[PDB]
Every structure is written in C-alpha cells, then in structure tokens.
Amino acid sequence: SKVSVAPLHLESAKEPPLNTYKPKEPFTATIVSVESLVGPKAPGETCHIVIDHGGNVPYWEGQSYGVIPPGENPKKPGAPQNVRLYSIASTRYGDNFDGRTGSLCVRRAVYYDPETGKEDPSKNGVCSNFLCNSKPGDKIQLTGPSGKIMLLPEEDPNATHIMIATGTGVAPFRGYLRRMFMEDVPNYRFGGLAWLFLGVANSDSLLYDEEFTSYLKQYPDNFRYDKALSREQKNRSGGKMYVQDKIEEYSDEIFKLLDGGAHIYFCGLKGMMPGIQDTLKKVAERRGESWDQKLAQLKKNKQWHVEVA
Numbered sequence: 046s047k048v049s050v051a052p053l054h055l056e057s058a059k060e061p062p063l064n065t066y067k068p069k070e071p072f073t074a075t076i077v078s079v080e081s082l083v084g085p086k087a088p089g090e091t092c093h094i095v096i097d098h099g100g101n102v103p104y105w106e107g108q109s110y111g112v113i114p115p116g117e118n119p120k121k122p123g124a125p126q127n128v129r130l131y132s133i134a135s136t137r138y139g140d141n142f143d144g145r146t147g148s149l150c151v152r153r154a155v156y157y158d159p160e161t162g163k164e165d166p167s168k169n170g171v172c173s174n175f176l177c178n179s180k181p182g183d184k185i186q187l188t189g190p191s192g193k194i195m196l197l198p199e200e201d202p203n204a205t206h207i208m209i210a211t212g213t214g215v216a217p218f219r220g221y222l223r224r225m226f227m228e229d230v231p232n233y234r235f236g237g238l239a240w241l242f243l244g245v246a247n248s249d250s251l252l253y254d255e256e257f258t259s260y261l262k263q264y265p266d267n268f269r270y271d272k273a274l275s276r277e278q279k280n281r282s283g284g285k286m287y288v289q290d291k292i293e294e295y296s297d298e299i300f301k302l303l304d305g306g307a308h309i310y311f312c313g314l315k316g317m318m319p320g321i322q323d324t325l326k327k328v329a330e331r332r333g334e335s336w337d338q339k340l341a342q343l344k345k346n347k348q349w350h351v352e353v354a
C-alpha cells in the first residue's frame with residue numbers, strides 16, 4: 046500500500062536541521078539525475094534534479110537547499126558565487142526512499158531581448174541553467190538546509206492543508222503530499238484533507254501531474270486537486286485563468302475550511318500574491334466579511350504560510 050521508506054531514524058530529531066553546511070565550506074554533493082518536467086509548448090524548461098547528499102544534509106519537508114554555482118562572484122573578485130535557494134521538492138527520505146537524496150524543481154531563467162527575441166549567454170540565470178544543464182556524476186556545492194516558514198504542521202494529523210502553488214512553487218507540496226499519502230511513515234498517519242491548487246501557463250507546463258492525479262484515485266476522501274492553465278483557460282471576467290480564479294470557484298468551501306482551522310500555503314513567484322489578495326478581498330466582501338479582519342485572524346492563529354520570491 047504505502048511505500049517503505051528508510052531509515053526511520055530520520056523521524057527522531059525534534060527540530061529541523063538548519064545551516065548544517067555554510068557557504069565557505071559547502072557539502073560537495075553528486076547529481077543522480079536531471080530531467081525536464083515539461084513539454085514542448087511550455088514557455089521555458091523546468092527540470093527535476095536528484096542530488097545524492099549521502100545522508101550528510103538531511104532536511105525536513107518544506108525547507109530549502111542552497112546551491113553555489115561555479116565561477117567567481119562578478120561583483121566580488123576572488124570570491125565564490127552567492128548562494129541561490131531552491132525549495133526541496135522531495136520528502137526527507139527522497140525519491141529513492143533511502144534518506145540519501147533530495148530533489149529540486151528548477152525553472153531555467155533565460156533572457157530574451159524584449160524586441161528581437163534574441164538571446165545572450167551572459168544574461169541567462171547562472172544557477173538555474175547550471176542545475177538544469179547538470180548530468181549524472183556532476184558535483185554540486187550544497188549549503189543549508191534553511192527555512193522554517195513552510196514546515197508542515199503535524200501536531201494534528203487530521204488537519205486541513207490548502208496548498209496554493211504557481212510554477213516551481215509546487216516543490217514543497219510534492220514533499221508534503223508524498224509524506225501524507227505515498228510513504229509508510231508510522232508516526233504520521235494523515236487523515237485530514239489536503240487540497241492542492243496549481244497554476245501554470247498551459248498543460249505542457251504541468252509539474253508532477255501524474256503523481257497528483259494518482260492521489261485522487263488512491264485517497265479520494267482526503268485529497269483534492271485543481272489546476273489553472275492561464276494561457277489555455279480564461280476566468281469568469283475574461284482574464285487569463287489564474288490560481289486565484291480557481292480559489293474563487295471554491296470560495297464558500299475554502300472560507301468555511303479556513304474558519305474551521307485549515308492551514309493555507311502559498312509558494313512560487315511573488316507576482317502571484319497581488320491577484321490572490323485581490324480575489325480574497327472581493328470574495329470576503331461578497332460574503333459581507335472584511336478580508337483585512339480575516340487575514341489578521343489567520344496570521345494570529347498561525348494558519349497563513351507564504352514563501353515567495
């Protein structure tokens with residue numbers, strides 16, 4: 046039924062690891078695999094990178110790894126490159142179920158001249174292309190792990206978790222959902238509701254869709270999954286279908302779940318948040334509620350979890 050994971054001593058630590066490796070002495074990890082997650086119509090490549098850390102850089106679900114790309118710091122001669130953070134997309138056991146690997150979900154940052162569409166190697170994103178250009182056996186300078194905002198609250202195994210992602214913001218939720226549904230973790234038997242909302246540009250830009258869809262058939266009473274394909278669908282007002290439009294489609298259900306104590310999570314590019322806030326204010330107003338009052342309450346109750354950049 047559930048997949049055996051090892052070693053179960055990874056459940057014993059009472060606190061998440063933080064800054065085990067630091068930039069001046071990173072951990073030299075080894076690439077296991079790199080693959081594209083997306084199809085030909087996707088605006089850009091997003092890749093799935095599996096990294097062998099040998100058990101030397103454990104983490105909890107929701108944390109980030111740092112990666113120091115090669116080369117000198119362009120603004121600090123003689124110095125290494127600045128760390129880039131990546132949300133870990135794997136559980137603490139990893140994609141090999143052995144506690145030795147972790148995975149990243151990385152969008153290639155590529156520069157196009159806004160008029161001609163021409164390229165320029167010196168303007169592409171350094172660390173994202175480094176990662177998606179990697180091959181098995183390549184070495185990676187790893188730092189961290191870091192972050193606590195997106196730790197999964199496990200005190201109540203029957204909690205409700207409403208997960209709102211755009212693009213690579215799905216990464217921590219892939220980790221959450223594997224821990225909730227896929228892996229045999231005897232000390233955490235999830236029996237609540239986990240509701241994943243994912244916005245991407247088009248069907249070819251979907252990330253891990255087969256995995257999430259499988260949870261609908263395995264855990265129909267504990268998982269829901271809704272997608273917004275912005276260039277392929279339009280909202281009720283003529284706009285491109287964004288994730289906030291999908292929340293709006295379920296406004297009454299979601300607001301009732303929040304009032305009942307649900308956690309809600311937001312992850313991805315910071316550009317996703319203004320439209321979400323606009324939708325939530327409009328929804329609140331139609332219900333005769335104040336979104337300001339409601340958000341202040343959610344934050345005070347520690348139901349509101351945002352990590353965007």
Ligand SMILES: Cc1cc2nc3c(=O)[nH]c(=O)nc-3n(C[C@H](O)[C@H](O)[C@H](O)COP(=O)(O)OP(=O)(O)OC[C@H]3O[C@@H](n4cnc5c(N)ncnc54)[C@H](O)[C@@H]3O)c2cc1C
Nearest residue numbers: 129130131132150151152154168169170171172173213354
């Ligand atoms: C907590 C956290 C978690 C994150 N999680 C993820 C994740 O899971 N996945 C993910 O893909 N990203 C994630 N990010 C973003 C990630 O950390 C990087 O910032 C991103 O990958 C870009 O880094 P880079 O080294 O590729 O680009 P950089 O080399 O830092 O360049 C940044 C941008 O500037 C552009 N640029 C460079 N030079 C020029 C120029 N001369 N003219 C115009 N433009 C230029 C680049 O093309 C790029 O878009 C996260 C960020 C944070 C803070």
Ligand SMILES: NC(=O)c1cccnc1
Nearest residue numbers: 213214313314352353354
């Ligand atoms: N955790 C983050 O801030 C994040 C994740 C994915 C993409 N961009 C930022």
Ligand SMILES: [Mg+2]
Nearest residue numbers: 083084249251
């Ligand atoms: Mg696909």
